[PDB]
Amino acid sequence: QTKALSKATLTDLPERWENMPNLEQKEIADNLTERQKLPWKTLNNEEIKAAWYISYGEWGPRRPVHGKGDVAFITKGVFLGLGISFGLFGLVRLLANPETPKTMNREWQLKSDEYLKSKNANPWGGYSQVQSK
Amino acid sequence: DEETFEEFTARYEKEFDEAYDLFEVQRVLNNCFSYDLVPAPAVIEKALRAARRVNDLPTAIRVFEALKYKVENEDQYKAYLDELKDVRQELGVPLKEELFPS
Amino acid sequence: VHFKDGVYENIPFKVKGRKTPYALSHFGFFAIGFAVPFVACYVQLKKSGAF
Amino acid sequence: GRIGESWVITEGRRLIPEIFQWSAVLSVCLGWPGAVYFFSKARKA
Amino acid sequence: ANKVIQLQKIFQSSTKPLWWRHPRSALYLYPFYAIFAVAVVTPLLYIPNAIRGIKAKKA
Amino acid sequence: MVQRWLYSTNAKDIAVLYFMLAIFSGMAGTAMSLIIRLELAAPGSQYLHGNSQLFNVLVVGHAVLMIFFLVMPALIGGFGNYLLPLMIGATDTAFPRINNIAFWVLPMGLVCLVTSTLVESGAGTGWTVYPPLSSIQAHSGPSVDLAIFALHLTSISSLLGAINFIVTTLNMRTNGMTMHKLPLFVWSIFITAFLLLLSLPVLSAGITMLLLDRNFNTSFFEVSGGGDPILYEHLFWFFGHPEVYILIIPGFGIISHVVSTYSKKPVFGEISMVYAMASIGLLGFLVWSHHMYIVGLDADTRAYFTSATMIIAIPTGIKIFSWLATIHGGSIRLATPMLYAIAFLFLFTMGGLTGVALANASLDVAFHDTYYVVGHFHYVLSMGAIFSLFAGYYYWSPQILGLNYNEKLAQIQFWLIFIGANVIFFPMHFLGINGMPRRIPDYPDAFAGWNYVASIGSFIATLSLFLFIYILYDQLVNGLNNKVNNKSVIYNKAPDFVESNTIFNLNTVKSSSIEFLLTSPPAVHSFNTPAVQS
Numbered sequence: 001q002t003k004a005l006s007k008a009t010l011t012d013l014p015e016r017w018e019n020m021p022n023l024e025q026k027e028i029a030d031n032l033t034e035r036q037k038l039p040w041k042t043l044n045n046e047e048i049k050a051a052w053y054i055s056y057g058e059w060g061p062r063r064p065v066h067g068k069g070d071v072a073f074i075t076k077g078v079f080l081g082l083g084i085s086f087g088l089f090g091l092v093r094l095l096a097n098p099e100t101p102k103t104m105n106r107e108w109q110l111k112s113d114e115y116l117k118s119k120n121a122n123p124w125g126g127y128s129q130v131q132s133k
Numbered sequence: 134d135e136e137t138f139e140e141f142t143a144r145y146e147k148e149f150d151e152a153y154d155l156f157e158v159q160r161v162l163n164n165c166f167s168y169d170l171v172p173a174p175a176v177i178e179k180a181l182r183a184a185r186r187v188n189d190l191p192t193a194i195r196v197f198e199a200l201k202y203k204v205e206n207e208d209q210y211k212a213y214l215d216e217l218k219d220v221r222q223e224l225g226v227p228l229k230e231e232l233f234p235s
Numbered sequence: 236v237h238f239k240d241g242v243y244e245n246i247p248f249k250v251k252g253r254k255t256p257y258a259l260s261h262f263g264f265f266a267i268g269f270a271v272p273f274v275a276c277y278v279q280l281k282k283s284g285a286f
Numbered sequence: 287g288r289i290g291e292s293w294v295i296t297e298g299r300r301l302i303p304e305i306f307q308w309s310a311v312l313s314v315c316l317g318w319p320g321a322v323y324f325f326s327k328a329r330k331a
Numbered sequence: 332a333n334k335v336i337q338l339q340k341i342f343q344s345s346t347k348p349l350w351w352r353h354p355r356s357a358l359y360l361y362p363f364y365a366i367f368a369v370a371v372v373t374p375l376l377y378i379p380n381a382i383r384g385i386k387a388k389k390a
Numbered sequence: 391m392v393q394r395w396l397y398s399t400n401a402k403d404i405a406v407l408y409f410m411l412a413i414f415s416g417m418a419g420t421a422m423s424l425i426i427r428l429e430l431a432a433p434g435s436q437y438l439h440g441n442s443q444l445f446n447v448l449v450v451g452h453a454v455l456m457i458f459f460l461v462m463p464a465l466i467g468g469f470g471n472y473l474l475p476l477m478i479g480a481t482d483t484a485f486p487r488i489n490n491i492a493f494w495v496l497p498m499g500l501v502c503l504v505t506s507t508l509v510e511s512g513a514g515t516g517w518t519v520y521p522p523l524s525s526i527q528a529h530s531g532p533s534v535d536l537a538i539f540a541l542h543l544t545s546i547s548s549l550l551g552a553i554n555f556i557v558t559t560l561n562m563r564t565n566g567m568t569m570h571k572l573p574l575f576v577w578s579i580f581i582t583a584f585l586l587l588l589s590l591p592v593l594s595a596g597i598t599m600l601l602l603d604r605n606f607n608t609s610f611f612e613v614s615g616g617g618d619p620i621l622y623e624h625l626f627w628f629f630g631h632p633e634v635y636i637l638i639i640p641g642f643g644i645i646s647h648v649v650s651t652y653s654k655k656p657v658f659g660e661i662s663m664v665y666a667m668a669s670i671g672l673l674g675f676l677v678w679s680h681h682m683y684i685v686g687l688d689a690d691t692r693a694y695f696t697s698a699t700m701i702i703a704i705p706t707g708i709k710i711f712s713w714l715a716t717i718h719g720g721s722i723r724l725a726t727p728m729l730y731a732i733a734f735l736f737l738f739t740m741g742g743l744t745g746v747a748l749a750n751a752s753l754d755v756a757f758h759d760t761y762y763v764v765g766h767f768h769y770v771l772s773m774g775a776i777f778s779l780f781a782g783y784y785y786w787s788p789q790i791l792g793l794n795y796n797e798k799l800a801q802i803q804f805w806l807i808f809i810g811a812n813v814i815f816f817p818m819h820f821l822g823i824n825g826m827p828r829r830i831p832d833y834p835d836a837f838a839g840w841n842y843v844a845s846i847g848s849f850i851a852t853l854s855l856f857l858f859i860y861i862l863y864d865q866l867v868n869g870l871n872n873k874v875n876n877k878s879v880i881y882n883k884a885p886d887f888v889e890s891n892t893i894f895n896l897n898t899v900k901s902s903s904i905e906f907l908l909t910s911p912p913a914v915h916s917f918n919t920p921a922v923q924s
């Protein structure tokens with residue numbers, strides 16, 4: 001015999017349900033449980049949206065594992081982490097025995113590759129030992 | 134070894150009638166939908182009668198979302214919704230689609 | 236049962252009741268472990284001589 | 287019965303893009319040093 | 332001489348720790364802590380002589 | 391306070407002491423690995439002014455500090471002594487003073503190792519401390535003694551803890567837990583306690599033999615006198631392959647829990663998987679000479695030890711097929727331990743495929759002592775055991791320490807380590823198939839290509855560890871507030887499709903084990919009355 005609720009405390013419940021002072025969450029769940037005992041053609045479709053949302057809405061324990069708008073956050077976190085890893089690597093490379101070994105230039109490596117073709121290196125794969133400026 | 138579809142639908146038809154609270158019908162529905170095969174119409178109609186008996190309209194909304202995810206087509210879904218339209222006009226339960234249109 | 240249960244009372248270090256900041260002894264306990272091999276390198280590099 | 291539409295043409299309409307998405311994820315997963323070789327000086331870039 | 336009941340009495344009738352409950356558990360454990368103190372600190376006083384290479388002289 | 395952390399007998403205090411020692415020595419080992427990869431960045435002497443001996447002492451400090459001081463005291467020490475008695479409902483372990491000395495022997499092993507690194511040079515030998523390099527004529531000074539003593543101490547620790555484990559799992563089960571109905575992590579600690587007790591004493595025999603041969607003028611391995619340095623390789627590797635299976639059986643026990651609780655369906659065929667675990671445990675004792683394919687054996691030892699090392703592939707195969715079976719057809723909740731678990735099984739099958747490629751003695755003559763092997767085991771150690779460690783921490787520490795972590799921070803930590811460690815350990819197969827040897831501080835300059843990318847990957851991995859340690863700080867000072875906001879995840883399992891968000895609040899956890907139904911951070915005496923079970 002419990003009649004329907006006010007309009008202006010249930011209009012658009014699934015968006016203000018979490019900014020809710022938490023006492024009235026209880027005194028809006030219980031009267032919906034009370035109103036469900038009627039024949040189901042009695043109920044206006046404003047509460048059937050509200051009764052579905054308190055049970056099956058994406059709130060509380062049905063919150064997603066990550067919200068809408070944080071896969072962007074962790075993609076940006078991954079990419080900034082790669083960037084600062086590259087940067088600290090390139091910084092600490094600037095303190096490491098400041099001379100290069102004499103082989104690592106094109107004034108050594110094409111003499112090496114001429115020596116490999118001089119002694120007939122691999123015909124199938126490459127022998128060209130060039131990797132430096 | 135294991136169980137025929139017809140005996141399965143004779144088992145859950147009894148198990149939905151043997152419910153007493155909202156934990157139990159929400160348990161028996163979860164147990165009958167987490168099988169390989171989608172349940173027969175006579176099983177989910179006992180499920181709709183059970184969810185009517187325990188005064189919960191949200192699970193009677195959820196039965197159709199559950200079958201819609203369970204079937205492989207939407208022609209099977211329209212077949213289901215004409216197989217049980219008159220029970221959806223006897224109980225008057227709404228589907229999630231026309232109550233939440235996109 | 237003589238041992239006080241709590242949330243921060245399953246650890247052998249204080250966090251809350253503290254004069255120093257906690258992050259000091261946190262990152263200190265972990266940075267001493269990170270600086271174990273650098274001290275190892277310093278002592279061996281001076282022992283053979285180059286650093 | 288075979289209600290309406292056939293069983294792996296609905297599964298075909300499902301998993302045709304999964305083939306290409308799998309090929310993308312494995313071609314990135316295993317073929318990432320190919321870009322290092324492309325931008326390398328072993329190509330004498 | 333079958334002292335087990337007289338010792339069960341005082342080993343349950345005390346809230347001193349178990350390595351103190353006996354009467355003569357001073358004569359063991361006062362020398363033992365001194366021997367332990369002179370036993371663990373003396374290896375590690377020799378470690379800066381060991382890291383820098385000074386051996387112990389035969390004199 | 392001294393009675394609870396220095397005289398302690400409760401299992402949880404000893405377990406978190408194990409854990410903090412493990413993370414201390416783990417970053418102390420990855421600092422060595424960072425110095426190694428910085429020395430291996432470009433050819434020539436880069437940071438270490440020559441001094442190849444120091445490169446060897448850093449390599450073996452990395453190896454010992456990562457195996458005997460992080461993975462073991464973090465898996466069988468920490469997770470073992472914590473979650474064995476709570477998941478079997480035991481009120482403590484049997485033999486608790488054994489557990490306390492099994493912890494406190496380990497800092498003394500750490501002290502012996504780092505004083506070994508500071509006297510003459512350190513053990514410059516290999517983590518396999520193979521003679522006659524490790525004896526007096528090639529390694530003078532007291533360093534290799536102190537390394538052998540460190541390994542003696544961890545032998546004592548994880549033998550006494552294994553005895554403690556086996557009697558408290560054979561004697562302290564609850565009222566309904568028979569042997570078939572154990573959780574799949576206690577079966578893992580059961581089997582590694584077996585392999586520990588059956589594998590540690592041949593190692594202890596071998597290394598005190600080496601200690602006597604260095605220090606007491608004996609001859610077991612000196613060929614000048616009649617010994618053989620291949621008796622040592624047998625005595626080492628008969629321990630050494632059971633060691634690399636006890637480094638991953640508790641990882642299997644962790645991953646089987648993680649995939650079950652995030653698929654929300656039980657593990658497909660649970661006792662075929664305990665049979666698979668026991669089969670890997672037995673058959674790991676019959677394969678030890680696959681590290682010895684090159685030393686000059688028979689033809690048919692290398693025919694037997696190639697078939698027996700590939701019948702290992704079948705129970706591991708059905709474990710991985712069973713994992714993918716129980717992940718097929720579930721509701722996958724993509725949380726941080728689930729990400730770690732699926733990356734575990736993908737990268738572990740990659741390491742297993744390259745391990746079966748190594749397992750052929752016909753082919754291992756093209757791959758022994760090359761970087762193919764170091765790719766094989768850094769795909770199943772840093773991707774098997776370490777990924778299981780991260781999954782276990784991110785899966786159990788909201789229960790244990792009671793404070794949640796920032797979840798999106800945990801997912802960038804996961805993706806950073808999964809990118810960067812794949813980036814370091816993938817070109818090692820390329821260098822090894824091109825012929826790059828192991829344990830060298832300086833390579834030929836045609837190997838300079840794929841070493842730069844690997845040192846970059848190590849920098850990504852070390853910064854992932856720095857992000858993880860900031861996650862630990864944020865958990866330990868803001869985890870109470872990580873409850874009140876939603877920078878975390880609170881409920882391990884989502885509600886099912888038809889139960890709703892009050893029924894789930896009356897049934898807030900749906901677990902197959904006791905460990906989550908306990909009080910967060912649990913009581914000092916859990917289970918005074920015993921946990922009944924059907």
Ligand code: HEA
Binds near residue numbers: 413416515811828
């Ligand atoms: C546990 C085993 C383990 C792990 C994880 C690693 C990880 C790494 N290792 Fe390796 N390594 C070995 C065991 C391991 N290693 C062994 C046994 C050898 C053979 C030695 C020999 O040949 O004599 C070896 C040799 C070896 C080589 C071959 C060089 C040589 O043979 O001389 C290299 C070069 O790249 C290397 C570097 C690295 C790097 C950069 C990492 C990076 O992955 C480091 C980054 C890792 C992390 C960031 C892990 C997270 C840190 C934690 C502390 C976990 C915390 C989590 C919890 C507490 C839950 N180590």
Ligand code: HEA
Binds near residue numbers: 707710738743754758
């Ligand atoms: C976590 C530790 C760990 C694990 C689990 C393994 C697992 C395996 N390992 Fe390995 N290994 C090491 C740690 C480990 N290893 C270490 C530390 C070294 C170097 C030691 C040193 O320093 O010298 C080493 C080196 C090593 C060698 C010695 C070669 C050499 O040193 O030169 C061999 C030889 O047989 C080997 C093979 C295997 C095989 C066949 C497996 C198998 O268990 C893998 C099984 C998994 C699969 C096979 C994939 C999954 C299965 C399927 C998808 C089903 C179908 C698959 C098939 C039919 C193949 N590895």
Ligand SMILES: [Ca+2]
Binds near residue numbers: 431432
């Ligand atoms: Ca170098």
Ligand SMILES: [Cu+2]
Binds near residue numbers: 630631634680681
């Ligand atoms: Cu092995």
